Design a protein around this ligand. Structure first.
Ligand SMILES: Nc1ncnc2c1ncn2[C@@H]1O[C@H](CSCC[C@H](N)C(=O)O)[C@@H](O)[C@H]1O
Ligand SMILES: O=C(Cc1ccsc1)N1CCC[C@H](c2[nH]nc3ncccc23)C1
Length: 274
């Protein structure tokens, strides 16, 4: 199928997002960029961190199999290079919705300039304590001026499509979202099935972004911006560095169906206050 159209477009989205806030970090900390990749998966963003020229990376995921794949991909990157430097990394298996990551870090008092949480944080909204815990994990160890960036389904788009659907499901040939019931969107535990054909079929939880925003305040976070994937793309392609990067990473235009899948998402970035 066309899995890698969406995969690579989404990776271009993450690269533009990561690149933007790495540049904002580097405008101050050219010294020792430290990044928490929360829900790193199998390490899809390792290369972006390598190109970002960061110094330390904590890769953590709930799936141990994915963390070890992340570790292996990292060691493969490290084991050969045109380059001479590459960030150091630690790899932590953990439910960042239930466990304190500082309990696992090599260095507990370490601080991050960026916590990147790409397509992960909505799993934290099973419950308030889990949503709070993931925020704490993403944000508590952020240095003042550090960034909490991520991508997560846009609850408005999900709900809008749900209310517009004649059923509790919606989607196309590429993806299906099924809510358990309609009109019942609890702050937490609002579960729905997300099926991305050939990619993932996993239950997710509605993240009402104003709720995520309010909750980030508890960790001295302020929203830098929230952008739908449409807003973000339409804005970011205007910069032709981003455009060319999309031509190099992408496999061609997204299909209407792919864009329908991708458009459920939003990009967000918060900054740790002084
Ligand atoms: N509670 C939790 N804590 C840590 N990671 C979680 C999690 N719930 C889900 N995940 C992870 O979130 C990831 C979602 S897929 C996104 C992976 C990666 N960030 C990327 O952009 O490619 C998966 O790897 C999954 O294992
Ligand atoms: O583009 C991405 C990142 C990506 C794409 C292909 S592999 C990583 N997205 C959007 C759709 C779902 C992805 C997702 N969520 N949960 C997952 N679990 C397992 C595997 C994938 C998972 C996140």
């Amino acid at each position: 199928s066309r899995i890698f159209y969406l995969r690579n477009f989404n990776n271009w989205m993450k690269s533009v997002l990561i690149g933007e806030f790495l540049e904002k970090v580097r405008q101050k900390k050219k010294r020792d960029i430290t990044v928490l990749d929360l829900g790193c998966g199998k390490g899809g963003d390792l290369l972006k961190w390598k190109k970002g020229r960061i110094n330390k990376l904590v890769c953590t995921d709930i799936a141990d199999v994915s963390v070890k794949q992340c570790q292996q991909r990292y060691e493969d990157m490290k084991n050969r290079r045109d380059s001479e430097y590459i960030f150091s990394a630690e790899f932590i298996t953990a439910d960042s919705s239930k466990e304190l990551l500082i309990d696992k870090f090599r260095d507990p008092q370490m601080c991050f300039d960026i916590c990147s949480c790409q397509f992960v944080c909505h799993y934290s909204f099973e419950s308030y304590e889990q949503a709070d815990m993931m925020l704490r994990n993403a944000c508590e160890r952020l240095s003042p001026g550090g960034y909490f960036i991520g991508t997560t389904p846009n609850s408005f788009e999900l709900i809008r499509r749900l209310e517009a659907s004649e059923t509790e499901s919606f989607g196309n040939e590429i993806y299906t979202v099924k809510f358990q019931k309609k009109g019942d969107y609890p702050l937490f535990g609002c579960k729905y099935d997300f099926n991305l054909e050939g990619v993932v079929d996993v239950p997710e939880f509605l993240v009402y972004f104003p709720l995520l925003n309010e909750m980030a305040k508890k960790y001295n976070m302020k929203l830098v911006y929230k952008k739908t994937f449409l807003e973000f793309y339409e804005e970011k392609i205007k910069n032709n560095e981003n455009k060319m990067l999309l031509k190099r990473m992408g496999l061609g235009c997204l299909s209407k169906s792919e864009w329908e899948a991708t458009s459920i998402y939003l990009v967000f970035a918060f900054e740790k206050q002084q």
